């Protein structure tokens, strides 16, 4: 109960950096977490959007001085064979806990070095 | 009605060269057509089996002197998004007619040069 998490929905991974910048400039937040699943669909190339999103999140966190943790993940292969579907459920379940621990420790450290 | 086609079922693309060799050595056939859809499932590599099948069909047709036409096709991308599923139905529909024309022409030419 010491930390409250607010959920913000967004149509796609491309819309995350600007939303993060707005929420960072509005204050009220010690850290920002952005999660998405960027997938190569086999028709169009997907690396441009992933690179843009990662670089934009880094630029936003450098601009506003608010930590932004990345949970946008691009798998090597995903062909929707229900085996990948079963695997990535549990893998993202693990990644959520990892991101929570990272966010807690980075916020604590940043508050420590500011004194 | 001048040409009769007999259908032979086979569990996978790997089992085609030996079946073709048996049907070629048994006689009764002027040409042999082998069809399969070799797909990269995203877990294991698929090029070894495709290379083996193509080379084996070529070796069989050189050994038995019976034409073997290849309708084993390996797409660049296939992620089972129902768009690929709709596309490849019609594309294989076209490939069947192409293979029929090729078989007729090659049998006629081979019978011609043997006189």
Active-site option among B28, B45, B110, B112: B45
* Whole-angstrom distance, CA of residue B32 vs CA of residue B16: 11
Closest Cα in chain A, distance from residue B40 (Å): 9
Using a CB-CB distance cutoff of 8 angstroms, which residues of chain A are in contact with residue B43? 77, 81, 83
Query: Using a CB-CB distance cutoff of 8 angstroms, which residues of chain A are in contact with residue B44?
Result: none
Binding site feature residues of B? 13-15, 37-39, 70, 84
User: How many other CB atoms sit within 10 Å of the CB of residue A68?
Assistant: 23
Tell me whether B44 touches chain A (CB under 8 Å): no
Q: Is there a contact between A51 and A15 (Cβ–Cβ < 8 Å)?
A: no
- Outline where B40-82 has alpha helix (H): 47-64
How far is B34 from B25, CA to CA, in rounded Å? Answer: 16
B42 → closest Cβ in A41, A43, A84: A84
Which tokens hold the place of B99? Answer: 């293979």
Please give the C-alpha separations between residue B9 and each of A33, B6, B30, B32, in angstroms, as whole numbers. 54, 10, 19, 13
Q: Do A79 and B84 touch (CB under 8 A)?
A: no
Does B41 contact chain A (CB < 8 Å)?
Answer: yes
Contact B13, B72 (CB under 8 A): yes
Residue A84, chain B, CB below 8 Å: the answer is yes
Question: Hey, is the C-beta of A46 within 8 angstroms of any chain B C-beta?
Answer: no
Cα angle, residue A71 at apex, residues A69 and A72 outer, rounded to 5°: 120
Active site residue B112: no
By CB atoms closer than 10 A (0-12, 13-18, 19+), residue B72 is middle
Nearest by CB: B84 against A40, A42, A83:
A42
Alpha helices for chain A (secondary structure H): 16-25, 47-64, 83-113
Please answer whether residues B8 and B64 qualify as being in contact, where contact means their C-beta atoms are separated by less than 8 angstroms. no
């Amino acid at each position: 109960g010491s930390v409250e998490v607010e959920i913000f929905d967004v149509p796609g991974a491309y819309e995350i950096p600007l939303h993060a910048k707005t929420l960072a400039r509005t204050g009220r937040y010690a850290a920002i977490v952005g999660a998405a699943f960027v997938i190569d669909g086999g028709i169009y190339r997907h690396d441009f959007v992933a690179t843009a999103v990662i670089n934009g999140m880094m630029q936003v966190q450098l601009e506003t001085e608010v930590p932004v943790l990345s949970v946008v993940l691009t798998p090597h292969h995903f062909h929707e064979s229900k085996e990948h579907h079963d695997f990535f459920h549990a893998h993202f379940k693990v990644k959520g806990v990892e991101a929570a621990h990272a966010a807690l420790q980075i916020v604590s450290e940043r508050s420590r070095i500011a004194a």
